[PDB]
Design a protein around this nucleic acid. Structure first.
Ligand SMILES: [Mg+2]
Ligand SMILES: [Zn+2]
Ligand SMILES: [Zn+2]
Ligand SMILES: [Zn+2]
Lengths: 42, 41, 62, 62, 97, 94, 283, 424, 61, 398, 38
RNA sequence: AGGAGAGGUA
């Protein structure tokens, strides 16, 4: 699951050649943060 | 008159003029003007 | 950057006084009177509440 | 300012009265390029070429 | 004295110009201030002594305190071949030769 | 052993007490309480290494009481004083 | 060669403010009591957090750090045991004696900015609820969306480490100085010199009496030991005009609490902890 | 076959660049809870010629047993106690212990009671001297100890020290007399540390360490601080005004002395002779030409700066008259730990003479005011027009001080003067 | 970026730089002013004594 | 008569007294002032002919002799130098250091949009604070990014000799509450024209670790199928992963790691007046020499640095900050400006501090925190503005 | 750059050895003069 | 992995 840039759409592309956002034209993707438990010491 | 303006008024005017100068030209304007002149002419 | 809590110098709870300080500044109150109205007798808390800069607004906007 | 050699430059490494209000004479990098790199003052502007013709207006003044 | 012409030594010319006033000038203590050619006039020992005096003056001007034996060892090491060689590679090569 | 006992051979009626995991808040009050006793001649504490949490107390007494006895008496007196202060505070707060 | 007899008189007492005078004691006892109540009294605070969703503009560590500094009620701090000394459990979630679990969940579905304060922080134990003063301590600010959900626990800790378990706030004590006036050299001074001497004091510690035309001592506890009036008297030419010396056996305490425990309860806990430490040190 | 580093091992410490053989010092490894940092005693900074401002020490761990054996027998700290350059002691008291010892031995009016003296006796290795002060007042019990006896517990009983210059006499390990000077405490030909090293040379390091600890404790008990009163250097406003007027008159007198000294040339032989000259007023009324003439010649500039220093030593001497005994700057200057008298003079009264090293194309107007900078004929505006000059030797006097506030032209002059040492 | 709207300013630049640099390969490049001799003033030098007239565009010194 | 109209000339605006009276006619843009002749641009060559006044007060004393006037004398300095309070009260070398090195090495506001930037070694302070004192240049610029750092209570006193050789002793309690705590973000870039993949612990199916994974030494950060592994001194927590490509078709991957840099013992801190030093010892709050009101000093510095470095005005800055911060037992007409060439007099600062209820010399009586006894000499205390440099302890460990 | 005299300096004159550590140094008056904190 | 160029520390 990847998030595009100025356009809001989930890419979810894992192919090597798939770097361009679908239904878009920009090639900038941000990795989305999943629901994982992380422990921190205050 | 020469001294009718007052001392504090001149200080406030100097501060306002400095603020206006910083608002108009900005911190960097020489590079922008040089680049714009190169493109146009 | 939200207001720093616990006022590192002398350890005073000032985390809930930023909104009141802004409200006092919105009226015809100076910084000294606004800080005095918050029951702050030490200058460390006054420095903490006077030197803070509101940066989270720009983070939310940008 | 470009210098032929870094070991010796001359009098360029020292402040000059022509720096009054144009470049900062109190701040300069320390090291090999000591005095060669000069920071411009706050009220510093660089003039640009004027498209208007000044020769025509000079004869009108006398 | 001017050094325009190196054919004649400056001390040699100075001695000739002082003939009318030989008595006034005390020649028992007069010596050139240079170190290199002083050995050719008053011997290696006089040049070594003047070098030691100049080194002591330089140390005093520097503000530090240095023992006498170090300066004496430096003077004896720099004049072991009868001449004060330079600190460059040529001087060391000549000293070894 | 939190508290260690080490007698001094050079000086008679002299001992050194080493307390681990202690700070100035205890050494200062112990030293001040020791000075009240007339039999105590030398009483002091030192913290040589801030990183090593240890307190060394040196007690010198006359030929009438052991340094350990004086130390125990000072501790008991300090405890009694603290109890009296607590009672006074409890009475005043009500 | 025996114990002392302290005397305590309370001037003002409130939930978080207490000002009382201690007499017939050495400065060492007052200093030790201050140190114990400022660094040895244990409280309960958040030390371990576990977040699940964090899409805010602030980092997770920043939120955890500002969460760990939130004051909590510590009425059970003396009875609770330390985490390292708890052999019943290794420590995970809610615990019977050591760990109190906290749950937080914030979701913004409106256009207005949502402020996540300390009021919406729920815990299983009703006795470890955060102290409410007001709007509460603001944690983060959320725009439309940007959900924040986390799980945190609180453990008993000493104020010596991390400086977040210390309930005391500006515990001070003075020697309660006594002002001595010779009252004979003041007659030689002129009317103008008296006003100059009065205005030389940084604080309002000396007063002027119009009916007697002489200086008087009002509120001697606000002298602050600033050698300004003495210096002015020396400059005017009177060396022995005013003599001020601290009192060794008199003290005035000023204890301000952070809301975790009451000031009187804080003093009692400090005394109990000092007694326990002395008993442990006892051979 | 390898084991981790532990206590008792020796390492070779060095601070680059190695300007002397004393940089290499073998020290025993001590494990500390601190991480990513190494702790060194502040006294040992003198052999390394470094300070704690970002300096990094790189050490060498010997692996061979013979290398370790020879490391602590020749390169150890106790083997390098005698400096090989001048023959004096290598280790001094430091910047803090020197000041603490000066304060202890100078005041002579603060008496330490039994409790404080016993507390300080823990660090000192020797026993406690007699109080020597039984009653200081008719109604004063608890006999006290004098300050100079506290410093007397730092010497062996068999050690005798005499310093006639400072009137310091040490008999049977007790300090008997001391007046002023603080020269025996500092490094020198007849310092007490050198005598202690020449006496035993077996426990000097422990004595120095104990002295440093005791002096640090005593200074913590006392407390040293720098406030605005130290920089003001006056009791009240009237004293400050009197000091300012005195400084102005002294600077004027120094300028007059320099102008008089400028006449010691072959051109004024007729005027300097004992005869009748009608041009006496010409040499006095020409005040603005003397600076221009000085800025053009090098020998004249050297004579002027020498005369200015000679006449300004007296001006600098006024700090002791206008400074109190409690002034921190005065204490640190007299102790010699840090700073000098001229630095205090520049701090409070006036900076003084400001001259550059190399020649420049501009010269200071000798006035450093708003009107001087706007003068077309001023030397700062290229040339004064008196033939046209091409080079100048800057020479300016700043009447203001740092505390008062530097004039923009004065700030420019100071920047020009201090431009040196910026380029390495 | 220049003369952009309020909505376009919210998304994009952080409003901390006025934009005096260049983007060549993802790294910011900034020009530094070069001090040059004036070419419209008569220049007189010494050793030897000479006066030179600078060239504006073509080499007519 | 010489007239220049070419480019490259440097000029500054100067007030003209001839048209100054036209201003008063019963916020003005700069263009309007230029058009009306109130202000004009003067070149370097033209300035030598005109007579220019330095200050407004000096202009009114002797009129009809000054052709031009300066708006402010502090504008002559640079942007990084004019903001320094009491610039002329310090030595030239220290001002040079502060305006050249320490300003660049300070840690403050990084950016308000960290997601769009993948720059290497991005550092941001948790709680940046503006200085108590005000500067005319800073007020006119209306930007708080000129000052980077935090202000803490600084007491000039010796502390068991742990601050010798210009060292710094800080308060452990103050640092643990969030003072001088900053985050460091480091980015790693890889270019692929092989493909991204795991190829057989924390890596996902796409070849990149999930957000929130604690990366350590010897762990693969970018998987290519080669892979890129973290070095000995590389560690952090994954913040974001950015995938992008150019027109040529070459794929780029950027991974950013963030970590918290608490003030360590070896860290180096700098002041606003050229004072440089490293942390000497971390002392507990209970052991500091607390004042009468219990305000313990956060930072303790050795008094021996002042006579050597010769940096006056830092004490003046501390006194001014203390006077501003302390309440008055009428807050109007309070001196706050710290213009380098318009510094208030020492008498004014002393009077302002005296009206606040403290000693006029800035020193207050303190009590030892270890024994409780009162110190014989008062200790100067004041909230100066300090900065944290980018040089750390672990960065120099080798 | 590694040529001529620089080659000699970097090869035969100046050499790098193992078992070396480099760290920032701070002050500690509690430690002895002949002891180094590691 | 080796080099070239800049900004920097003691
Ligand atoms: Mg250094
Ligand atoms: Zn898209
Ligand atoms: Zn506070
Ligand atoms: Zn449990």
């Amino acid at each position: 699951t990847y998030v595009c840039g100025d356009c809001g759409q989930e890419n979810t592309l894992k192919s090597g050649d798939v770097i361009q956002c679908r239904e878009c034209g920009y090639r900038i993707l941000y990795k989305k943060r999943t629901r994982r438990v992380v422990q921190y010491e205050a | 008159n020469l001294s009718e303006l007052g001392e504090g008024f001149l200080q406030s005017f100097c501060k306002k003029a400095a603020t206006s100068f910083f608002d108009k030209y900005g911190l960097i304007s020489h590079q922008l003007n040089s680049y714009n002149y190169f493109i146009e002419h | 950057m939200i207001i720093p809590v616990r006022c590192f110098t002398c350890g005073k709870v000032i985390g809930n006084k930023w909104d009141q300080y802004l409200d006092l500044l919105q009226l015809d109150y100076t910084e000294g009177d606004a800080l005095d109205a918050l029951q702050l007798v030490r200058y460390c808390c006054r420095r903490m509440l006077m030197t803070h800069v509101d940066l989270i607004e720009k983070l939310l906007n940008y | 300012q470009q210098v032929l050699y870094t070991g010796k430059v001359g009098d360029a490494r020292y402040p000059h009265p022509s720096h009054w209000g144009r470049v900062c004479f109190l701040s300069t990098p320390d090291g090999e390029n000591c005095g060669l790199v000069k920071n411009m003052s706050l009220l510093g502007l660089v003039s640009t070429q004027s498209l208007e013709s000044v020769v025509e207006k000079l004869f009108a003044c006398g | 004295m001017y050094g325009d012409r190196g054919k004649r030594n400056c001390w040699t010319a100075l001695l000739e110009t002082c003939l009318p006033i030989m008595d006034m000038i005390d020649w028992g203590r007069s010596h050139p201030d240079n170190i290199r050619q002083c050995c050719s006039v008053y011997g290696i020992d006089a040049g070594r002594s003047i070098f030691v005096a100049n080194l002591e003056s330089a140390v005093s001007d520097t503000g530090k305190e240095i023992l006498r034996e170090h300066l004496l060892l430096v003077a004896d090491s720099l004049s072991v071949t009868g001449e004060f060689v330079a600190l460059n590679a040529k001087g060391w090569s000549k000293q070894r030769q | 052993k939190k508290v260690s006992y080490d007698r001094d051979t050079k000086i008679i009626n002299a001992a050194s007490f080493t307390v681990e995991r202690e700070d100035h808040t205890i050494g200062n009050i112990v030293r001040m309480q020791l000075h009240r006793d007339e039999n105590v001649l030398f009483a002091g504490y030192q913290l040589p290494h801030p990183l090593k949490y240890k307190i060394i107390v040196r007690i010198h007494t006359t030929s009438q009481s052991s340094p350990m006895q004086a130390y125990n008496q000072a501790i008991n007196d300090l405890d009694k004083e603290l109890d009296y202060l607590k009672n006074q505070f409890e009475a005043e707060v009500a | 060669t025996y114990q002392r007899f302290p005397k305590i008189k309370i001037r003002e007492l409130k939930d978080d403010y207490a000002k009382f005078e201690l007499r017939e004691t050495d400065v060492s006892m007052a200093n030790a009591l201050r140190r114990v109540m400022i660094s040895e009294v244990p409280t309960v605070a958040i030390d371990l957090v576990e977040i699940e969703v964090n899409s805010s503009v602030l980092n997770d560590e920043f939120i955890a750090h500002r969460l760990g500094l939130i004051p909590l009620t510590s009425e059970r701090a003396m009875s609770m045991r330390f985490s390292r000394d708890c052999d019943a459990c290794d420590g995970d979630g809610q615990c019977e004696f050591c760990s109190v679990e906290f749950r937080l969940s914030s979701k913004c579905v409106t256009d207005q900015t949502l402020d996540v304060t300390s009021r919406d922080l729920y815990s299983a134990d009703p006795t470890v609820t955060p102290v409410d003063f007001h709007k509460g301590i603001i944690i983060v600010k959320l725009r439309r969306g940007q959900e924040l959900k986390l799980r945190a626990i609180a453990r008993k800790g000493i104020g010596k480490d991390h400086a977040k378990w210390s309930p005391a706030a500006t515990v001070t004590f003075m020697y309660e100085p006594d002002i001595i006036i010779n009252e004979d050299m003041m007659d030689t001074l002129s009317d103008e010199e008296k006003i100059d001497l009065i205005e030389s004091s940084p604080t309002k510690v000396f007063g002027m009496d119009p009916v007697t035309r002489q200086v008087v001592v009002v509120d001697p506890e606000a002298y602050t030991y600033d050698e300004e009036v003495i210096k002015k008297a020396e400059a005017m030419g009177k060396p022995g005009l005013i003599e001020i010396s601290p009192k060794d056996d008199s003290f005035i305490f000023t204890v301000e609490s952070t809301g975790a425990v009451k000031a009187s309860q804080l003093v009692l806990n400090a005394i109990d902890l000092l007694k326990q430490k002395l008993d442990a040190v006892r051979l | 076959i390898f084991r981790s580093l532990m206590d008792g091992d020796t390492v070779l410490m060095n601070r680059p660049p190695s300007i002397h053989q004393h940089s290499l010092i073998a020290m025993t490894v001590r494990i500390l809870p601190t991480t990513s940092v190494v702790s060194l005693n502040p006294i040992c900074c003198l052999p390394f010629r470094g300070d704690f401002d970002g300096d990094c020490l790189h050490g060498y761990v010997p692996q061979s047993i013979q290398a370790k054996v020879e490391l602590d027998e020749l390169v150890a700290l106790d083997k390098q106690l005698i400096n090989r350059q001048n023959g004096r002691n290598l280790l001094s008291l430091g910047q803090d212990s020197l000041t603490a010892a000066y304060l202890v031995n100078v005041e002579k009016n603060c008496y330490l009671n039994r409790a404080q003296m016993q507390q300080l006796q823990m660090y000192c290795p020797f026993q406690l001297p007699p109080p020597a002060i039984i009653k200081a007042s008719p109604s004063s019990t608890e006999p006290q100890w004098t300050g100079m006896q506290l410093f007397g517990m730092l010497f062996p009983p068999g050690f005798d020290y005499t310093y006639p210059l400072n009137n310091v006499v040490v008999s049977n390990g007790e300090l008997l007399s001391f007046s002023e000077g603080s020269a025996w405490l500092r490094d020198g030909e007849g310092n007490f540390i050198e005598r202690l090293l020449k006496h035993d040379k077996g426990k000097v390091l422990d004595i120095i360490y104990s002295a440093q600890e005791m002096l640090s404790q005593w200074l913590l008990m006392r407390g040293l601080s720098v406030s605005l009163a130290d920089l003001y250097l006056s009791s009240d406003l009237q004293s400050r005004k009197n000091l300012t007027e005195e400084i102005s008159y002294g600077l004027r007198e120094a300028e007059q002395v320099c102008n008089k000294q400028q006449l010691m040339v072959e051109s004024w032989r007729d005027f300097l002779a004992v005869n009748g000259e009608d041009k006496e007023e010409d040499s006095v009324s020409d005040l603005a030409r003397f600076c221009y003439e000085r800025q053009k010649s090098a020998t004249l500039s050297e004579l002027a700066v020498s005369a200015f220093k000679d006449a300004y030593r007296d001006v600098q001497a006024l700090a002791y008259r206008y400074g109190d005994q409690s002034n921190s700057f005065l204490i640190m200057s007299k102790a010699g730990s840090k700073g000098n008298i001229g630095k205090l003079v520049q701090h409070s009264m006036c900076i003084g003479l400001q001259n550059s090293a190399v020649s420049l194309s501009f010269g200071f107007p000798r006035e450093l005011t708003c009107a001087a900078w706007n003068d077309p004929n001023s030397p700062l505006r290229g040339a004064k027009g008196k033939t046209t000059t091409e080079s100048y030797v800057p020479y300016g006097v700043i009447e203001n001080s740092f505390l008062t506030g530097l004039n923009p032209l004065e700030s420019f002059v100071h920047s020009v003067t201090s431009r040196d040492s910026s380029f390495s | 970026t220049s003369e952009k709207g309020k909505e376009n300013c919210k998304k994009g630049d952080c409003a901390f730089d006025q934009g005096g640099y260049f983007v060549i390969k993802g790294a910011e490049k900034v020009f530094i002013a070069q001090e040059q001799m004036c070419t419209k003033r008569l220049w007189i030098s010494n050793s030897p004594w000479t006066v030179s007239f600078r060239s504006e565009n073509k080499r007519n010194r | 008569v010489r007239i220049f109209t070419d480019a490259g000339r440097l000029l500054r605006p100067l007030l003209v007294v001839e048209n100054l009276q036209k201003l008063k006619q019963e916020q003005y843009p700069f263009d309007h002032l230029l058009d009306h002749g109130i202000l004009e641009l003067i070149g370097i060559e033209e300035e030598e002919d005109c007579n220019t006044a330095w200050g407004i007060k000096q202009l009114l004393k002797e009129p009809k002799i000054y052709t031009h006037c300066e708006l402010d004398l502090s504008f002559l300095l640079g942007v990084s130098c004019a903001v320094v309070p009491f610039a002329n009260h310090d030595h030239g070398r220290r001002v040079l250091y502060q305006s050249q090195k320490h300003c660049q090495q300070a840690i403050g506001f990084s950016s308000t949009n960290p997601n769009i930037r993948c720059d290497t070694l991005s550092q941001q302070l948790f709680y940046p604070q503006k200085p108590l004192f005000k500067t005319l240049a800073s007020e006119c610029l209306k930007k708080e990014v000129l000052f980077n750092g935090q202000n803490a209570i600084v007491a000039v006193n010796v502390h068991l000799g742990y601050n010798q050789e210009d060292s710094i002793v800080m308060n452990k309690a103050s640092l643990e509450r969030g003072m001088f705590r900053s985050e460091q973000i480091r980015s790693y870039k890889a270019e692929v024209d092989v493909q991204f993949g795991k190829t057989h612990d924390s890596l996902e199916d796409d070849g990149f670790p999930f957000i929130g994974a604690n990366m350590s030494t010897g762990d693969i950060v970018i998987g290519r199928c080669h892979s890129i592994k973290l070095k000995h001194t590389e560690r952090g927590i994954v913040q974001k992963v950015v995938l992008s490509s150019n027109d040529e078709g070459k794929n780029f991957a950027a991974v950013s790691l963030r970590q918290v840099r608490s003030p360590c013992l070896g860290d180096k801190f700098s002041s606003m007046h050229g004072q440089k030093g490293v942390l000497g010892y971390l002392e507990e709050q209970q052991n500091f020499p607390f004042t009468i009101q219990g305000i313990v000093p956060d930072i303790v510095i050795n008094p021996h640095a002042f006579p050597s470095r010769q940096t006056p005005g830092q004490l003046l800055e501390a006194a001014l900050s203390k006077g501003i911060a302390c309440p008055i037992q009428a807050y109007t007409k309070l001196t706050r400006h710290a213009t380098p060439f318009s510094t208030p007099g020492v008498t004014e600062i002393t009077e302002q501090l005296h009206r606040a209820g403290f000693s006029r010399w800035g020193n207050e009586r303190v009590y030892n925190g270890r024994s409780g006894e009162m110190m014989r000499s008062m200790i100067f205390m004041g909230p100066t503005f300090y900065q944290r440099l980018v040089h750390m302890s672990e960065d120099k460990v080798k | 750059k590694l040529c001529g005299l620089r080659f000699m300096k970097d090869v035969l004159l100046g050499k790098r050895s193992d078992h070396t550590f480099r760290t920032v140094v701070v002050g500690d008056p509690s430690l002895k003069l002949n002891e180094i904190g590691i």
